[PDB]
Amino acid sequence: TATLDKAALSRLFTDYSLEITPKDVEALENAAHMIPPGTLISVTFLPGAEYEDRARAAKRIQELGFRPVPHLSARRLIDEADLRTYLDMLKGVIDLKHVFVIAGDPNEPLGIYEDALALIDSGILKEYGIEHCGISGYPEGHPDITDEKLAKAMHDKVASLKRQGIDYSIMTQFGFDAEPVLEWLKQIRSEGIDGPVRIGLAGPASIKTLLRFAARCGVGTSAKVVKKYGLSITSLIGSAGPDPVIEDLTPVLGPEHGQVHLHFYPFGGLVKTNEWIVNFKGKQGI
Ligand SMILES: Cc1cc2nc3c(=O)[nH]c(=O)nc-3n(C[C@H](O)[C@H](O)[C@H](O)COP(=O)(O)OP(=O)(O)OC[C@H]3O[C@@H](n4cnc5c(N)ncnc54)[C@H](O)[C@@H]3O)c2cc1C
């Protein structure tokens, strides 16, 4: 039994993914020795960077032996020329095969793309030779978007990518308990959504940082979950890692959940996050 439990944990941790901002290239260089070659590393898209900064980060990811995944924030783009400015820049520096497309955090779109589907269905990703497009998933819903609109958006984006012959994957918002993603993942399989799913996990970080992100992201923080994950603001430790969620995922994930990997959000710093992964695997004997 210990042997089979270790094997299931080793499979779940195979091909885990990471992310950086354009400000984190030095951290990536320091972390690289213990990051598996080929690891998918996102470059998130948020205000406060130039396209050149994002392209340089993606280039370094590739040079270090990893697979860059530029994020595209639809609502931050003014028009097709704006998007092509970034895509042309990326195509010139990386093997542009993976992107991740989201509506973006603006409350009001800045341009011609209302949401991720508007960008995806425009055809532009196919023009640039993209073979993999990731999309969001929200097992606990979203503060601004109804469950029904989230599900329809997922179905419409999957349908658009299928029509264009572009493979897709899903990356979920993190949670502080495994129950929402376990239920939600089986449900999307039932609706015929069979693409690979990367279950998002919050990396080890200060409890205050985790709770601030969770409030902004609409992540559940019921009393029972806060106690189980260890998120008390009077905690003697002051930080929390994702082991409570991993401990439910590894035994309960099954064939009914389909193709599943893990994604780590480095809320506490990329080096700290990957060191946690290395040390967790070591303590579990994998
Ligand atoms: C894994 C992951 C990575 C992310 N990375 C980034 C990132 O790099 N940069 C970033 O800015 N954000 C990022 N986000 C956040 C995401 O942009 C926001 O959650 C956004 O509010 C919704 O984007 P979406 O792609 O899920 O929405 P979509 O699937 O595009 O939209 C879902 C539905 O809601 C509508 N809609 C979209 N936005 C709103 C709104 N604000 N109010 C009401 N209806 C709306 C759409 O028209 C559509 O009908 C990420 C989220 C996830 C889960």
Side-chain angles (χ1 to χ4, degrees), residues 1-22 24-106 108-161 163-185 187-223 225-226 228-286:
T1 299
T3 295
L4 282 154
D5 288 343
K6 283 185 187 157
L9 189 70
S10 198
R11 292 190 295 270
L12 183 61
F13 270 79
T14 295
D15 193 29
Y16 70 85
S17 48
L18 297 165
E19 56 181 61
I20 60 167
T21 82
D24 302 315
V25 169
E26 186 209 299
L28 170 65
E29 292 169 337
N30 292 339
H33 170 62
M34 293 305 298
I35 297 174
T39 295
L40 290 155
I41 305 186
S42 292
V43 181
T44 56
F45 196 102
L46 291 169
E50 304 287 346
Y51 292 132
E52 66 196 349
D53 309 332
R54 301 186 182 97
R56 283 182 69 179
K59 178 181 179 280
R60 290 300 288 137
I61 290 165
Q62 179 171 285
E63 291 174 339
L64 291 170
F66 313 124
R67 281 178 294 163
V69 186
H71 287 203
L72 304 177
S73 171
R75 289 176 166 209
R76 293 218 131 88
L77 298 156
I78 297 316
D79 55 17
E80 188 185 333
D82 198 11
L83 175 53
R84 284 184 183 272
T85 285
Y86 188 30
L87 289 180
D88 289 328
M89 201 175 303
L90 290 168
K91 188 174 109 185
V93 298
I94 58 162
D95 190 5
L96 180 61
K97 302 209 165 307
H98 295 82
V99 297
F100 192 84
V101 180
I102 53 267
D105 282 314
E108 169 90 346
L110 290 177
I112 66 170
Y113 307 111
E114 166 84 19
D115 54 25
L117 174 70
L119 191 157
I120 287 163
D121 200 54
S122 76
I124 190 151
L125 305 182
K126 194 73 176 189
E127 175 176 359
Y128 282 83
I130 283 149
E131 294 170 14
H132 301 278
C133 185
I135 62 179
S136 61
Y138 303 89
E140 301 189 275
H142 187 288
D144 313 317
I145 307 164
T146 61
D147 288 357
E148 291 79 6
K149 291 271 281 185
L150 291 168
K152 181 162 199 303
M154 176 168 284
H155 278 285
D156 290 343
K157 292 180 297 195
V158 167
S160 179
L161 290 166
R163 161 184 80 73
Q164 298 178 67
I166 302 169
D167 285 326
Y168 75 92
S169 64
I170 297 165
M171 183 170 303
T172 65
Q173 188 55 277
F174 75 95
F176 293 133
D177 198 276
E179 184 72 31
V181 70
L182 287 167
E183 301 185 7
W184 175 95
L185 183 52
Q187 173 60 24
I188 70 168
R189 301 320 191 188
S190 288
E191 310 178 19
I193 301 164
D194 65 346
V197 171
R198 293 184 165 278
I199 297 180
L201 299 171
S206 92
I207 289 164
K208 286 302 202 47
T209 296
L210 295 171
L211 289 173
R212 278 189 283 269
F213 276 112
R216 296 180 289 250
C217 293
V219 168
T221 53
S222 68
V225 159
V226 161
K228 179 171 169 192
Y229 201 93
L231 296 163
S232 170
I233 59 175
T234 56
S235 160
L236 299 183
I237 300 170
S239 68
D243 39 317
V245 172
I246 292 160
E247 281 161 17
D248 278 318
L249 288 176
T250 311
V252 179
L253 282 167
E256 82 267 28
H257 299 106
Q259 304 182 70
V260 175
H261 315 286
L262 302 179
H263 177 83
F264 288 83
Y265 299 104
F267 295 135
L270 184 69
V271 168
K272 179 180 178 55
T273 300
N274 201 70
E275 287 178 342
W276 190 96
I277 293 166
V278 169
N279 294 335
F280 177 79
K281 282 168 64 186
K283 289 172 202 308
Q284 304 290 321
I286 66 157

